[PDB]
Amino acid sequence: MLTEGISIQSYDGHTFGALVGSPAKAPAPVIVIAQDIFGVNAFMRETVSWLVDQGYAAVCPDLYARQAPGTALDPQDERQREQAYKLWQAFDMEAGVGDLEAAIRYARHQPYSNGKVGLVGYSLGGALAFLVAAKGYVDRAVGYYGVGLEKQLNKVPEVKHPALFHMGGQDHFVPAPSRQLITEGFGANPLLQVHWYEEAGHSFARTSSSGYVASAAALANERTLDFLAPLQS
């Protein structure tokens, strides 16, 4: 689901929709939520509601609009999961980063914005959160179980604003990243903060997941919220 009428233009004229949550009280920092491989779906809507209940405004852009606008897949439906994997395999990461850039610009300019923008991304969005942190488009970025991070470690020195990452220590469908490669890579840049959840694999923060771990979800969520709080007025 998306907020009807919202249209954000990106770097090449491509336009995409977004699910927008206005804050309970204005002004407030705006959090751009980078979707997982299921599109802007029920978990994404829950994340927007959660952040609004925590004092933020939130914008979840339709990153799948370059392939199939308005895609919102049910992770519990096998055929929709297969569609999610197909869309993910065909996903253009650099274009995703450019769309998130455009969504951040949109976020900074909303009437209720306090001028501060953060980004929170999940697995598919988590990898995007790191790429966005390397570009430096947001004040603060957070990535939950970002896929393929070990491959992007050469970008560690480019991160100039804080970025926090929650890593599942166990393999599930996607393997867990190398604890060693990531810890060493991130350690060189104190603007990067990483936490490991040894009793969880990816998708641990989503209650609809077979990989949901309440204790990991809650601790990660508390770290995310403490990490985003400085953005608040």
Curated annotation (Swiss-Prot):
GO terms for molecular function: carboxymethylenebutenolidase activity. Pathway: Aromatic compound metabolism; 3-chlorocatechol degradation. The active site is at residues 123, 171, 202. The keyword Nucleotide-binding does not apply. Signal peptide: none annotated. Keywords: Aromatic hydrocarbons catabolism, Hydrolase, Plasmid, Serine esterase. InterPro entries: AB_hydrolase_fold, Dienelactn_hydro, Dienelactone_hydrolase-like. It catalyses: 2-(5-oxo-2,5-dihydrofuran-2-ylidene)acetate + H2O = 4-oxohex-2-enedioate + H(+). Gene3D superfamilies: alpha/beta hydrolase (3.40.50.1820). Its EC number is 3.1.1.45. One of its GO terms (biological process) is catabolic process. PANTHER family: ALPHA_BETA-HYDROLASES SUPERFAMILY PROTEIN (PTHR46623:SF6), CARBOXYMETHYLENEBUTENOLIDASE-RELATED (PTHR46623). Monomer. Ring cleavage of cyclic ester dienelactone to produce maleylacetate. Belongs to the dienelactone hydrolase family. Carboxymethylenebutenolidase is specific for dienelactone and has no activity toward enol-lactones. This is Carboxymethylenebutenolidase. The lineage of its organism: Bacteria, Pseudomonadati, Pseudomonadota, Gammaproteobacteria, Pseudomonadales.
